[PDB]
Amino acid sequence: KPFDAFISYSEHDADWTKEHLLKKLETDGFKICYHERDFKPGHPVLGNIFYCIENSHKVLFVLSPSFVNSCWCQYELYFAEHRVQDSLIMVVLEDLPPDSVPQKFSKLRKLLKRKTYLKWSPEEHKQKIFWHQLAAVLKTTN
Amino acid sequence: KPFDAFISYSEHDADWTKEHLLKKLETDGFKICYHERDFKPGHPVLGNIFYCIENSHKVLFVLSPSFVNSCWCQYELYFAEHRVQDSLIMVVLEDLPPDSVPQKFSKLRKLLKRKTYLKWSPEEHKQKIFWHQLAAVLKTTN
Numbered sequence: 001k002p003f004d005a006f007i008s009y010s011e012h013d014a015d016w017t018k019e020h021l022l023k024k025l026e027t028d029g030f031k032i033c034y035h036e037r038d039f040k041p042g043h044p045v046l047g048n049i050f051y052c053i054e055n056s057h058k059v060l061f062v063l064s065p066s067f068v069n070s071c072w073c074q075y076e077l078y079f080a081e082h083r084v085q086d087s088l089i090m091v092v093l094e095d096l097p098p099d100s101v102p103q104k105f106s107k108l109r110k111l112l113k114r115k116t117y118l119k120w121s122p123e124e125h126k127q128k129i130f131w132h133q134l135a136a137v138l139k140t141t142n
Numbered sequence: 143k144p145f146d147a148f149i150s151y152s153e154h155d156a157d158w159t160k161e162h163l164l165k166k167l168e169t170d171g172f173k174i175c176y177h178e179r180d181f182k183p184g185h186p187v188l189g190n191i192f193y194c195i196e197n198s199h200k201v202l203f204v205l206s207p208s209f210v211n212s213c214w215c216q217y218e219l220y221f222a223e224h225r226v227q228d229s230l231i232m233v234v235l236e237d238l239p240p241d242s243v244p245q246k247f248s249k250l251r252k253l254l255k256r257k258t259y260l261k262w263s264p265e266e267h268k269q270k271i272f273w274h275q276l277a278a279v280l281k282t283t284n
Protein backbone atom coordinates (compact mmCIF):
# COMPACT_ATOMS: atom_id res chain seq x y z
CA LYS A 1 0.00 0.00 0.00
CA PRO A 2 1.26 3.53 -0.77
CA PHE A 3 0.13 4.90 2.60
CA ASP A 4 0.93 3.56 6.05
CA ALA A 5 -2.31 4.91 7.54
CA PHE A 6 -5.54 6.70 6.77
CA ILE A 7 -6.33 8.93 9.75
CA SER A 8 -9.80 9.97 10.93
CA TYR A 9 -10.43 12.57 13.62
CA SER A 10 -13.09 15.03 14.70
CA GLU A 11 -13.05 18.73 13.87
CA HIS A 12 -12.85 19.32 17.64
CA ASP A 13 -9.62 17.28 17.74
CA ALA A 14 -8.17 18.72 14.52
CA ASP A 15 -5.60 21.05 16.10
CA TRP A 16 -4.14 18.34 18.33
CA THR A 17 -4.21 15.76 15.53
CA LYS A 18 -2.44 18.02 13.02
CA GLU A 19 0.11 19.51 15.44
CA HIS A 20 1.04 16.32 17.32
CA LEU A 21 -0.08 13.11 15.63
CA LEU A 22 0.30 14.01 11.94
CA LYS A 23 3.40 16.15 12.45
CA LYS A 24 5.15 13.41 14.41
CA LEU A 25 4.22 10.55 12.09
CA GLU A 26 5.10 12.50 8.94
CA THR A 27 8.36 13.79 10.44
CA ASP A 28 9.13 10.16 11.34
CA GLY A 29 8.72 8.97 7.73
CA PHE A 30 5.22 7.49 7.77
CA LYS A 31 3.02 8.27 4.76
CA ILE A 32 -0.45 9.34 5.86
CA CYS A 33 -3.81 9.76 4.01
CA TYR A 34 -6.48 12.07 5.44
CA HIS A 35 -9.51 13.67 3.81
CA GLU A 36 -8.97 17.27 4.89
CA ARG A 37 -5.80 17.35 2.74
CA ASP A 38 -6.18 14.42 0.35
CA PHE A 39 -9.88 14.36 -0.60
CA LYS A 40 -10.37 16.39 -3.78
CA PRO A 41 -14.05 17.00 -4.61
CA GLY A 42 -14.97 15.90 -8.12
CA HIS A 43 -11.70 14.11 -8.76
CA PRO A 44 -12.51 10.64 -10.14
CA VAL A 45 -9.74 8.97 -8.09
CA LEU A 46 -9.20 11.28 -5.12
CA GLY A 47 -12.79 12.45 -4.77
CA ASN A 48 -14.29 9.38 -3.19
CA ILE A 49 -14.17 7.83 0.25
CA PHE A 50 -12.79 4.50 -0.93
CA TYR A 51 -9.45 5.92 -2.09
CA CYS A 52 -7.68 6.46 1.23
CA ILE A 53 -8.76 3.27 2.97
CA GLU A 54 -8.12 1.12 -0.10
CA ASN A 55 -4.58 2.49 -0.36
CA SER A 56 -3.50 2.53 3.32
CA HIS A 57 -2.09 -0.31 5.39
CA LYS A 58 -3.89 0.84 8.56
CA VAL A 59 -6.90 2.95 9.49
CA LEU A 60 -6.32 5.05 12.60
CA PHE A 61 -9.15 6.70 14.56
CA VAL A 62 -8.51 9.51 17.04
CA LEU A 63 -11.25 8.89 19.62
CA SER A 64 -12.82 11.34 22.08
CA PRO A 65 -16.40 12.21 23.11
CA SER A 66 -16.42 14.84 20.34
CA PHE A 67 -15.70 12.06 17.82
CA VAL A 68 -18.17 9.49 19.19
CA ASN A 69 -20.97 12.07 19.50
CA SER A 70 -20.62 13.48 15.99
CA CYS A 71 -23.02 12.38 13.26
CA TRP A 72 -20.34 12.59 10.56
CA CYS A 73 -17.77 10.73 12.65
CA GLN A 74 -20.30 7.96 13.30
CA TYR A 75 -20.80 7.56 9.56
CA GLU A 76 -17.03 7.31 9.15
CA LEU A 77 -16.86 4.74 11.96
CA TYR A 78 -19.62 2.72 10.28
CA PHE A 79 -17.70 2.73 7.00
CA ALA A 80 -14.44 1.52 8.50
CA GLU A 81 -16.20 -1.12 10.59
CA HIS A 82 -17.95 -2.46 7.50
CA ARG A 83 -15.10 -2.05 5.00
CA VAL A 84 -12.24 -2.80 7.41
CA GLN A 85 -9.42 -7.00 11.35
CA ASP A 86 -5.86 -6.12 12.32
CA SER A 87 -5.80 -2.98 10.13
CA LEU A 88 -7.78 -0.92 12.67
CA ILE A 89 -5.93 1.25 15.20
CA MET A 90 -7.71 3.19 17.94
CA VAL A 91 -6.04 6.12 19.70
CA VAL A 92 -7.97 7.31 22.75
CA LEU A 93 -7.24 11.01 23.10
CA GLU A 94 -9.91 11.59 25.75
CA ASP A 95 -11.74 8.97 27.82
CA LEU A 96 -15.09 7.78 26.45
CA PRO A 97 -17.89 7.50 29.05
CA PRO A 98 -19.00 3.88 29.45
CA ASP A 99 -21.62 2.75 26.91
CA SER A 100 -21.39 6.09 25.06
CA VAL A 101 -20.47 4.38 21.78
CA PRO A 102 -23.78 3.43 20.07
CA GLN A 103 -24.57 -0.23 20.65
CA LYS A 104 -24.64 -1.07 16.94
CA PHE A 105 -20.89 -0.28 16.57
CA SER A 106 -20.30 -3.74 17.99
CA LYS A 107 -16.81 -4.25 16.54
CA LEU A 108 -15.51 -0.91 17.82
CA ARG A 109 -17.25 -1.68 21.13
CA LYS A 110 -15.50 -5.06 21.42
CA LEU A 111 -12.13 -3.46 20.63
CA LEU A 112 -12.59 -0.91 23.43
CA LYS A 113 -13.87 -3.53 25.88
CA ARG A 114 -10.83 -5.68 25.01
CA LYS A 115 -8.44 -2.78 25.77
CA THR A 116 -7.00 -2.81 22.21
CA TYR A 117 -6.19 0.86 21.88
CA LEU A 118 -3.39 3.26 22.71
CA LYS A 119 -4.25 5.95 25.24
CA TRP A 120 -2.83 9.46 25.13
CA SER A 121 -1.32 10.89 28.30
CA PRO A 122 -0.18 14.42 29.21
CA GLU A 123 2.97 13.09 30.93
CA GLU A 124 6.22 13.22 28.95
CA HIS A 125 7.24 9.71 30.04
CA LYS A 126 3.96 8.11 28.95
CA GLN A 127 3.89 10.10 25.70
CA LYS A 128 7.36 8.80 24.83
CA ILE A 129 6.12 5.21 25.22
CA PHE A 130 2.94 6.13 23.30
CA TRP A 131 4.84 7.23 20.20
CA HIS A 132 7.07 4.14 20.17
CA GLN A 133 4.04 1.87 20.60
CA LEU A 134 2.14 3.74 17.87
CA ALA A 135 5.03 3.26 15.45
CA ALA A 136 5.12 -0.44 16.42
CA VAL A 137 1.42 -1.00 15.84
CA LEU A 138 1.53 0.82 12.47
CA LYS A 139 4.18 -1.68 11.30
CA THR A 140 2.32 -4.87 12.33
CA THR A 141 0.94 -7.17 9.66
CA ASN A 142 -2.79 -7.28 8.91
CA LYS B 143 -42.63 3.37 11.80
CA PRO B 144 -43.09 6.77 13.51
CA PHE B 145 -41.57 8.68 10.57
CA ASP B 146 -42.55 8.50 6.92
CA ALA B 147 -39.04 9.42 5.74
CA PHE B 148 -35.52 10.18 6.85
CA ILE B 149 -34.16 12.87 4.52
CA SER B 150 -30.51 13.37 3.56
CA TYR B 151 -29.23 16.37 1.61
CA SER B 152 -26.04 18.36 1.13
CA GLU B 153 -25.27 21.62 2.90
CA HIS B 154 -25.22 23.21 -0.58
CA ASP B 155 -28.82 22.05 -1.11
CA ALA B 156 -30.01 22.88 2.42
CA ASP B 157 -31.94 26.06 1.58
CA TRP B 158 -33.91 24.43 -1.23
CA THR B 159 -34.50 21.27 0.80
CA LYS B 160 -35.79 23.13 3.86
CA GLU B 161 -37.87 25.74 1.99
CA HIS B 162 -39.44 23.44 -0.63
CA LEU B 163 -39.12 19.73 0.13
CA LEU B 164 -39.39 19.70 3.94
CA LYS B 165 -41.92 22.55 4.10
CA LYS B 166 -44.18 20.88 1.54
CA LEU B 167 -43.99 17.38 3.01
CA GLU B 168 -44.50 18.59 6.58
CA THR B 169 -47.34 20.93 5.57
CA ASP B 170 -48.88 17.93 3.78
CA GLY B 171 -48.86 15.78 6.94
CA PHE B 172 -45.79 13.61 6.41
CA LYS B 173 -43.56 13.06 9.45
CA ILE B 174 -39.90 13.57 8.57
CA CYS B 175 -36.60 12.72 10.36
CA TYR B 176 -33.43 14.66 9.50
CA HIS B 177 -30.17 15.05 11.40
CA GLU B 178 -29.85 18.84 11.31
CA ARG B 179 -32.98 19.07 13.51
CA ASP B 180 -33.34 15.61 15.03
CA PHE B 181 -29.79 14.47 15.82
CA LYS B 182 -28.95 15.43 19.41
CA PRO B 183 -25.25 14.96 20.26
CA GLY B 184 -24.71 12.80 23.33
CA HIS B 185 -28.32 11.70 23.57
CA PRO B 186 -28.35 7.89 23.97
CA VAL B 187 -31.36 7.49 21.65
CA LEU B 188 -31.28 10.55 19.40
CA GLY B 189 -27.51 10.94 19.26
CA ASN B 190 -26.69 8.12 16.90
CA ILE B 191 -27.06 7.60 13.17
CA PHE B 192 -29.18 4.47 13.48
CA TYR B 193 -32.16 6.25 15.08
CA CYS B 194 -33.66 8.03 12.06
CA ILE B 195 -33.27 5.24 9.52
CA GLU B 196 -34.47 2.57 11.95
CA ASN B 197 -37.62 4.59 12.66
CA SER B 198 -38.54 5.83 9.15
CA HIS B 199 -40.50 4.02 6.45
CA LYS B 200 -38.39 5.51 3.64
CA VAL B 201 -34.95 7.06 3.20
CA LEU B 202 -34.96 9.97 0.76
CA PHE B 203 -31.77 11.40 -0.78
CA VAL B 204 -31.68 14.83 -2.42
CA LEU B 205 -29.07 14.30 -5.16
CA SER B 206 -26.91 16.88 -6.94
CA PRO B 207 -23.21 17.16 -7.81
CA SER B 208 -22.67 18.90 -4.46
CA PHE B 209 -24.08 15.79 -2.73
CA VAL B 210 -22.21 13.19 -4.79
CA ASN B 211 -18.90 15.06 -4.51
CA SER B 212 -19.02 15.55 -0.74
CA CYS B 213 -17.02 13.26 1.53
CA TRP B 214 -19.66 13.35 4.28
CA CYS B 215 -22.53 12.73 1.85
CA GLN B 216 -20.66 9.73 0.43
CA TYR B 217 -20.38 8.27 3.92
CA GLU B 218 -24.12 8.78 4.36
CA LEU B 219 -24.77 7.13 0.99
CA TYR B 220 -22.60 4.17 1.99
CA PHE B 221 -24.56 3.77 5.22
CA ALA B 222 -27.96 3.76 3.56
CA GLU B 223 -26.78 1.43 0.80
CA HIS B 224 -25.48 -1.04 3.38
CA ARG B 225 -28.23 -0.65 5.98
CA VAL B 226 -31.12 -0.08 3.55
CA GLN B 227 -34.69 -2.37 -1.26
CA ASP B 228 -37.93 -0.49 -1.86
CA SER B 229 -37.35 1.91 1.07
CA LEU B 230 -34.87 4.06 -0.90
CA ILE B 231 -36.11 7.17 -2.72
CA MET B 232 -33.85 9.30 -4.92
CA VAL B 233 -34.77 12.89 -5.80
CA VAL B 234 -32.53 14.36 -8.49
CA LEU B 235 -32.39 18.10 -7.84
CA GLU B 236 -29.58 18.73 -10.33
CA ASP B 237 -28.33 16.39 -13.06
CA LEU B 238 -25.38 14.16 -12.15
CA PRO B 239 -22.63 13.95 -14.82
CA PRO B 240 -22.36 10.41 -16.19
CA ASP B 241 -20.14 8.09 -14.10
CA SER B 242 -19.67 10.79 -11.45
CA VAL B 243 -21.04 8.54 -8.69
CA PRO B 244 -18.09 6.46 -7.40
CA GLN B 245 -18.12 3.00 -8.93
CA LYS B 246 -18.36 1.22 -5.57
CA PHE B 247 -21.85 2.71 -4.90
CA SER B 248 -23.16 -0.03 -7.15
CA LYS B 249 -26.72 -0.09 -5.77
CA LEU B 250 -27.19 3.66 -6.11
CA ARG B 251 -25.57 3.41 -9.55
CA LYS B 252 -28.03 0.71 -10.66
CA LEU B 253 -30.97 2.76 -9.38
CA LEU B 254 -29.86 5.79 -11.42
CA LYS B 255 -29.14 3.68 -14.52
CA ARG B 256 -32.60 2.12 -14.14
CA LYS B 257 -34.26 5.58 -14.04
CA THR B 258 -35.78 4.94 -10.58
CA TYR B 259 -35.74 8.49 -9.27
CA LEU B 260 -37.91 11.58 -9.36
CA LYS B 261 -36.39 14.58 -11.13
CA TRP B 262 -36.98 18.17 -10.07
CA SER B 263 -38.03 20.67 -12.71
CA PRO B 264 -38.31 24.48 -12.63
CA GLU B 265 -41.62 24.39 -14.54
CA GLU B 266 -44.82 24.73 -12.50
CA HIS B 267 -46.57 21.96 -14.43
CA LYS B 268 -43.78 19.43 -13.90
CA GLN B 269 -43.36 20.44 -10.25
CA LYS B 270 -47.05 19.77 -9.65
CA ILE B 271 -46.64 16.22 -11.00
CA PHE B 272 -43.40 15.86 -9.00
CA TRP B 273 -45.10 16.52 -5.66
CA HIS B 274 -47.97 14.11 -6.37
CA GLN B 275 -45.51 11.41 -7.47
CA LEU B 276 -43.33 12.03 -4.40
CA ALA B 277 -46.32 11.60 -2.11
CA ALA B 278 -47.22 8.40 -4.00
CA VAL B 279 -43.76 6.89 -3.70
CA LEU B 280 -43.55 7.73 0.02
CA LYS B 281 -46.73 5.68 0.58
CA THR B 282 -45.61 2.54 -1.30
CA THR B 283 -44.87 -0.63 0.64
CA ASN B 284 -41.28 -1.77 1.22
Ligand SMILES: *SC[C@H](NC(=O)CC[C@H](N)C(=O)O)C(=O)NCC(=O)O
Pocket residue numbers: 008009010011012014034035036037039067070071072073074076213
Ligand atom coordinates in the same frame (compact mmCIF):
# COMPACT_ATOMS: atom_id res chain seq x y z
S1 LIG C 1 -15.07 12.67 12.38
C1 LIG C 1 -15.93 13.66 11.12
C2 LIG C 1 -15.65 15.16 11.18
N1 LIG C 1 -14.21 15.42 11.21
C3 LIG C 1 -13.71 16.51 10.62
O1 LIG C 1 -14.41 17.45 10.24
C4 LIG C 1 -12.22 16.53 10.42
C5 LIG C 1 -11.87 17.06 9.03
C6 LIG C 1 -12.53 16.21 7.94
N2 LIG C 1 -11.99 14.82 7.89
C7 LIG C 1 -12.45 16.89 6.60
O2 LIG C 1 -12.73 18.11 6.51
O3 LIG C 1 -12.14 16.19 5.61
C8 LIG C 1 -16.39 15.84 12.30
O4 LIG C 1 -15.83 16.21 13.32
N3 LIG C 1 -17.70 16.01 12.13
C9 LIG C 1 -18.27 17.35 12.12
C10 LIG C 1 -19.26 17.54 13.25
O5 LIG C 1 -18.97 18.34 14.16
O6 LIG C 1 -20.33 16.88 13.23
Ligand SMILES: *SC[C@H](NC(=O)CC[C@H](N)C(=O)O)C(=O)NCC(=O)O
Pocket residue numbers: 071150151152153154156176177178179181209212213214215216218
Ligand atom coordinates in the same frame (compact mmCIF):
# COMPACT_ATOMS: atom_id res chain seq x y z
S1 LIG D 1 -24.72 15.09 2.70
C1 LIG D 1 -23.70 15.50 4.14
C2 LIG D 1 -23.63 16.99 4.49
N1 LIG D 1 -24.97 17.57 4.57
C3 LIG D 1 -25.23 18.55 5.44
O1 LIG D 1 -24.35 19.17 6.03
C4 LIG D 1 -26.69 18.86 5.68
C5 LIG D 1 -26.94 19.06 7.17
C6 LIG D 1 -26.53 17.84 7.99
N2 LIG D 1 -27.37 16.64 7.69
C7 LIG D 1 -26.49 18.14 9.46
O2 LIG D 1 -25.95 19.20 9.85
O3 LIG D 1 -26.98 17.29 10.24
C8 LIG D 1 -22.72 17.75 3.56
O4 LIG D 1 -23.15 18.49 2.69
N3 LIG D 1 -21.41 17.57 3.74
C9 LIG D 1 -20.55 18.69 4.07
C10 LIG D 1 -19.52 18.94 3.00
O5 LIG D 1 -19.59 20.00 2.34
O6 LIG D 1 -18.62 18.08 2.82
